[PDB]
Design a protein around this ligand. Structure first.
Ligand SMILES: Cn1c(=O)n(-c2ccccc2)c(=O)c2cc(C(=O)C3=C(O)CCCC3=O)ccc21
Ligand SMILES: Cn1c(=O)n(-c2ccccc2)c(=O)c2cc(C(=O)C3=C(O)CCCC3=O)ccc21
Ligand SMILES: [Co+2]
Ligand SMILES: [Co+2]
Lengths: 382, 382
């Protein structure tokens, strides 16, 4: 069931913004680890005396990395005279965010038809305002409302080059890395209480619940009209044998925040080969692979979707496979991206649901909790 | 002239500690960019609820990267019951340092015979105490005094495995990168006033002035008895045609601090080839190369030390060459390591002064200021 109840016209995920202590080092690490190209900058060299912001791109995926300069560089400025290219930025907010949460996502940005209208309608429907609509160079409008914790939902709308005041990165400094990642599939929040979080976000967006089919969590997925903007949310389940990963997140993050970003690959086997080659030379690490019993049991579940060779390719890369009633999901999870056991990345590829591919084809892999446990127990038996 | 006036027995540079917002991302970037191996850790996985610390090594060079966790993880602790492996660490100090200065060196650590004695003698001779001597697992003693700005001089002494409480990094997560860097040659501070800075540091160490032969700076070099611990200091020269790079540093750093680390390579040509291959894929960028007039003029100055081919290798890597009356210096400078125009790295290799090689052989390249300007002007002519 999809009532298509969006209260304003939503297009696609636009970008994800990380708030960092040093944007340069995080961006260079992410670029190498994920195969993303440096494509735009806003920093001292572009006249921005407030913040350093570096944009990485892979296909349609946009990762922005921002850190504050010394406030003394911009002490003479006022908001009317700011040199910040993202006028919602605040030194105190950014330092407080990073000192409280460590490295993490500050903004989940979606493109809309009219960011001023989206902001107005959202706030009229219960959204907590974060930054009012601001028109940049009469070309782009940005506005922000609170999503959960200190994460904001950022609306961006264009009249007709990432943002004004950003400069394209010289091709010498712009190496064309590409490991196959193409777009953001979903962005997942961890909260202490799922019910109130869903009521709040569904309240001001009109996003609807995307239906699913002792893991430590309850979850639900909010979706836009065409189900291309997907915002799952988790809460912990307490009193379990193994401590809930959601609760550990909430403790180390100092509360609610963004838990994982799922990045769609046009060839998850190539992406994982390339990322795994770089794990120990500056890139990202992956969770430990499931036991071979998991891939032995892969035949009876998806033996009609993947050949035995393609199943062999999954086992040597540690890829997980799940299936709903409409499609098949290939997925794998990185270890946490930074010092704290908080944010991580998921790499995914979806098989099926062609009409273009419909959003969420194959689900989100919730079945892989049970299959993992079953495999683990029956691998010990063997 | 070397009066050998050290007030306590100093051995060698031991390590450099960076205070970071996220130690993981900075360390992974530096590892790939410089060819340093992950060799030790102290973090949540080792029981440290206070800070994450990751050690990179290349030869005898030791880079430590540290960032604070949420203070809430260790709220029950007191200094007697701390789980921090570096007991001088302070959450508030670290967040204040990083919010004030951005990514940079907090500690220049030297090995001494007796860190408690070095601390006592230093403070008795005017050193401002930072962290008193603390004996770790009855095996290592660390103490800290102020050096300049918020940078500390850290004394470490061993009775007879980096520090207690650190664990060796599993060889799977430990890729044996090596681009030829072997040790720290010198560590350079920027201050507003050179005179008082030298008087202070020479006052409590007994280090002596290491003699040199409109660049925007005045400088001097303090040295230990065998001139293997080398601590240059710069001050700006104001009212110049081009703004002093020292003054720009002081402005963007919010005051005095560590300006550059010079890393000795056992083969600067291999090091630069390897680092330059990685500049645009996560590594470090280098300052723009001198014009070919510079390398044309290289024959008449060092044509007796380097062949024409080895001079050719210098021009294609952008390496600078200088000479004193005892040896020859090969050097090159990176662009700043992080967001701010503050800290950078120098790669060096020294030729001559064999007896082992004596410290500072060839000087520090101060002659390369004039040679660069001369080359620049006479390249425009050609
Ligand atoms: C098997 N499995 C898993 O093991 N971990 C895991 C990772 C690192 C450390 C420990 C556990 C996951 O996080 C994980 C996450 C998902 C997931 O993406 C997801 C959604 O997107 C939204 C609906 C709720 C949901 O479940 C699926 C399977 C997962
Ligand atoms: C030619 N040259 C240079 O161009 N820069 C530069 C770098 C980036 C941006 C602009 C200028 C330098 O920093 C630089 C530094 C040194 C140096 O190391 C040094 C010492 O170690 C101690 C004594 C004082 C001193 O000079 C030598 C030559 C240098
Ligand atoms: Co997911
Ligand atoms: Co130097």
């Amino acid at each position: 069931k999809n009532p298509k109840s969006d209260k304003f016209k939503v297009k696609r995920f636009h970008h994800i913004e990380f708030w960092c202590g040093d944007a340069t080092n995080v961006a260079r690490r992410f670029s190498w680890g994920l195969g993303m190209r440096f494509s735009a900058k806003s920093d001292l060299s572009t006249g921005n005396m407030v913040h350093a912001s570096y944009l990485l791109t892979s296909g349609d995926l946009r990762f922005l990395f921002t850190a504050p300069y010394s406030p003394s560089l911009s002490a003479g400025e006022i908001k009317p005279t700011t040199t910040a290219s993202i006028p919602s930025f605040d030194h105190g907010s950014c330092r407080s965010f990073f000192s409280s949460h460590g490295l993490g996502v500050r903004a989940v940005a979606i493109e809309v038809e009219d960011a001023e209208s989206a902001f107005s309608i959202s706030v009229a429907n219960g959204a907590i305002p974060s930054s009012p609509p601001i028109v940049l160079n009469e070309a782009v409008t940005i506005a922000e409302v609170k999503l959960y914790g200190d994460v904001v939902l950022r609306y961006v709308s264009y009249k007709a080059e990432f943002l004004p005041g950003f400069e394209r990165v010289e091709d010498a400094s712009s190496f064309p890395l590409d490991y196959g990642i193409r777009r953001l599939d979903h962005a997942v929040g961890n909260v202490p209480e799922l019910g109130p979080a869903l009521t709040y976000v569904a309240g001001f967006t009109g996003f609807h619940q995307f239906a699913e089919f002792e893991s430590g969590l309850n979850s639900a997925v909010l979706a836009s009209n065409d189900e291309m903007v997907l915002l799952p949310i988790n809460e912990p389940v307490h009193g379990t044998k193994r401590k809930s990963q959601i609760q550990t997140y909430l403790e180390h993050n100092e509360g609610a925040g963004l838990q994982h970003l799922a990045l769609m690959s046009e060839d998850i086997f190539r992406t994982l080969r390339e990322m795994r080659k770089r794990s120990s030379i500056g890139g990202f690490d992956f969770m430990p692979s499931p036991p071979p019993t998991y891939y032995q049991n892969l035949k009876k579940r998806v033996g009609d979707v993947l050949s035995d060779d393609q199943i062999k390719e999954c086992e040597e890369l540690g890829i997980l496979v799940d299936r709903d009633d409409q499609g098949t999901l290939l997925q794998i999870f990185t270890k946490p991206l930074g010092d704290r056991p908080t944010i991580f990345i998921e790499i995914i590829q979806r098989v099926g649901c062609m009409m273009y591919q419909s959003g969420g084809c194959g689900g989100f892999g919730k079945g892989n909790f049970s299959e993992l446990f079953k495999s683990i127990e029956e691998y010990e038996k063997t």
